[PDB]
Structure 1
Amino acid sequence: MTTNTIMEQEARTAPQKIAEQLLANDAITESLGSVLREFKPKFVMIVGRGSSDHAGVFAKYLFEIEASIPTFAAAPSVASVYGKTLKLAGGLVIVISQSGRSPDILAQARMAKNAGAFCVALVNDETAPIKDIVDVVIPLRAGEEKAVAATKSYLATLSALLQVAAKWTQNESLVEAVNSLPQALQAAVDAEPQLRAGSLTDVKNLVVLGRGFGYAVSKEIALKLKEVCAIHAEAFSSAEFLSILDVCIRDESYGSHVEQIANVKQRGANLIHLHQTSADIHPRIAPLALLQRFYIDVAAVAIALGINPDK
């Protein structure tokens, strides 16, 4: 099944919107890359919605693995409630916010600027006041965000992070990945569904397991299952997890992850597999392709469960 939901419409527009984003942002991210190689960030702090920031979890793996620089999420309360200014000299702060207007986001941006960090904002609204606080805005270019469950705007956030990472590190592999990204998303949209409602009928509790980048995207999957399908879903590391949805990314984590899933299957668990739509996709793009496929799939699961994913 396919659906006429706004959620699905936005999800299906992501590949083209991201192709346009990457082209339009190539110059600004290139220059930001030059700034970052000159500045030499000691760490990367992500400012958003705290530890519950899914983009921030993805960013941790991205910058730690590609740039070897420790990356972490800020705790909003430290700036807003406790009134602290941290010592962030020589650090890079990346603010992630679609609207660029929330008072807790603006307070954290101001504190980062006052602490001496070089400050970058990934924001969808280019006219937002965050632009007058931070050093540079990288526009997300996702267009109008009309659905209640975010799809394209999340993928656009990850594409911008990836492009920022490619330009900074100049890692050749990652540059090729970013160049292949729009076509890889389209291929994922055009592929056969990976998740079908039938697998979820009669499931009220669900554990989503992943490793590494797969863990980052499992958090996003668990959230959408709760938001759109009314299924109590929770994401865990397959390493730490001492009815299961297997987020199966083919990257360096695949081997250990697969073995953990084999363990849960042997210990008698009930498994639903989300495999990549292609077994030859670049590993750093694979998580985005899997989310791309899933966003389209979950609109149909909703409608199949009698839920209107747009309400």
Structure 2
Amino acid sequence: MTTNTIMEQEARTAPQKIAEQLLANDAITESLGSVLREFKPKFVMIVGRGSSDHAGVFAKYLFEIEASIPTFAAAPSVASVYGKTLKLAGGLVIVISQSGRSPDILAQARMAKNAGAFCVALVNDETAPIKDIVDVVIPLRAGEEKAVAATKSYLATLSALLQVAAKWTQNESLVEAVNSLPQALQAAVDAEPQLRAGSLTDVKNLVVLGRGFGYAVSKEIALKLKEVCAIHAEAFSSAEFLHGPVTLVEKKLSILDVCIRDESYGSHVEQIANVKQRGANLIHLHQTSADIHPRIAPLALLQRFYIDVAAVAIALGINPDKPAGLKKVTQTL
């Protein structure tokens, strides 16, 4: 252990907290799976903000590939600004929020409920008012997240999503992934650090490249780089990065590679090799063990990153548990 930050401490508790969540939520997720197999959602909409939006992106890849059901993030403004009600009959809406207090999220949830959608909430604060809007609540059980930059609550969200998907689809491979998840996270905590501040010193802008599930995690990494290091980081698809943004490479760009060993490995590696040939300076992040389930590695890579980024934060003089001008509960419309 290096920094004395609340963030690192919370990150290191994530594996046990996730184990406890899967135990406590096995029954509720079994029942949600049985409800969903009968209901047959036409689509899945994800309401979030912050790291809960990035979690929504992960859920998109998860449910499209494992459940074959189109999944997307909602745009709060349609409800909260334009006062519009969408046609959501027969759709599944999942509200994601550690705090469950933001007005625009609560407005979207309420509108979705009024539209006849089935509404599921992944919440960490059981006392949040979201519980009075949604149909079923799945508690994240991460306990209170005191640092401003989320760690344990994000991992708890992805595990809840994975567990819901495992129970719903009953794909035994996904079931195996969720069952192995606590051990893969613990292994990730115990591995050697992967990211160090020295690689980032004098870097004010960055591009994070990933593919598929790796892209979903990349969105969260760029946020933490912005949130706790004041580095303008941006997440891209390694496929979509070559449709315009690669010109930034020619201006000496610093790219962080989220290499996840799932079925998008060969394409991602080939795209990264192309970008390398185009002259970029690459920092490679990877899952900590090559003996992890392809669906669980995204989370293993994130565990290591959260611990190592707390130290990069402290090294750059930023306090990751109280970043400048930020709050744990952020409220917008």
Change (3 A) 1:50 1:206: closer
1:85-138: per-residue Cα shift (whole Å, max 9, x none)? 111111111000112222212211111111111110001111222222211000
Aligned partners of 1:44 and 1:71 also within 8 Å:
yes
CA drift of 1:303 comes to 1.8
Contact 2:52 2:97 in 1 (8 A): no
Contact in 2 for aligned 1:50/1:76 (Cα 8 Å): no
Cα separation, 1, equivalents of 2:139 and 2:289: 30
* Partners of 2:185 and 2:299 within 8 A in 1: yes
**TM superposition shift of 1:52:** 8.3
Going from structure 1 to structure 2, the CA distance change for 1:201 and 1:22 (only over 3 Å counts) comes to same
Name the structure 2 match of 1:140.
140
Percent of residue pairs identical = 100
* Structure 1 position 2, deviation (Å): 1.9
Q: Contact 1:32/1:168 (CA < 8 Å) preserved in 2?
A: yes
Indicate if the aligned counterparts of 1:98 and 1:124 stay in contact, CA closer than 8 A: yes
Distance in 1, Cα, partners of 2:301 & 2:275: 22
Call closer, same or farther: CA 1:184–1:128 in 2, change over 3 Å: same
Q: What TM-score comes out, normalization by structure 2 length?
A: 0.90
Contact kept in structure 2, 1:50 and 1:74, CA below 8 Å: no
Q: For residues 228-268 of structure 1, what are the alpha-carbon distances to aligned partners after superposition, in whole Å with 9 as ceiling and x for unaligned?
A: 11212111111111911111000011100001111111111
Q: Secondary structure at the match of 1:125?
A: coil
CA distance, structure 2, for counterparts of residue 52 and residue 105 of structure 1: 11
Judging changes above 3 Å, is the alpha-carbon distance between structure 1 residues 50 and 76 closer, same or farther for their aligned structure 2 residues? Answer: farther
Question: In 2, Cα distance between the equivalents of 1:223 and 1:131?
Answer: 27
**Quick one: distance in 1 between partners of 2:91 and 2:51?**
19
Task: Provide closer, same or farther for how the CA distance between residues 308 and 50 of structure 1 changes in structure 2, counting only shifts above 3 A.
Answer: closer
Please list the CA deviations of residues 43-91 of structure 1 after superposition, one character each: whole Å capped at 9, or x if unmatched.
0011123998111111110111110000011110111111111111111
* Residue correspondences, number: 310
Query: Structure 1 residues 243 and 147 mapped into 2: Cα distance closer, same or farther (>3 Å)?
Result: same
Distance in 1 between residues matched to 2:125 and 2:8, nearest whole Å: 22
Q: Classify 1:104/1:180 alpha carbon distance in 2 versus 1 (closer, same or farther; 3 Å).
A: same
The runs of at least 4 aligned residues of structure 1 exceeding 6 Å deviation read: none
Encode CA deviations 1:146-190: one digit per residue, 9 max, x unaligned.
Answer: 111110011111111111111110010000000000110000000
Name the CA distance, whole Å, in 2 between partners of 1:50 and 1:264: 29
SS of corresponding position for 1:257 = helix
Could you say which residue in structure 1 is the equivalent of 2:213? 213
Cα distance 1:194–1:44, how it changes in 2: closer, same or farther (>3 A)? Answer: same
SS class of match (2:56): helix
The root-mean-square deviation of aligned C-alpha atoms, in Å, is 1.6
Matched-pair contact (CA < 8 Å) for 1:51–1:73: no
The alpha-carbon deviation at position 305 of structure 1 amounts to 2.3
Change (3 A) 1:159 1:51: closer
Structure 1 gap segments, 5+ residues each = none
Where does residue 315 of structure 2 map in the other structure?
A: 304
For the 8 Å contact 2:52–2:154, the answer to whether it is kept is no
Pick from 288, 292, 306 the counterpart of residue 303 of structure 2: 292
Over 3 Å counting, the alpha-carbon distance change for 1:52 and 1:288 in structure 2 is closer
In 1, the alpha carbon distance for the partners of 2:100 and 2:311 equals: 31
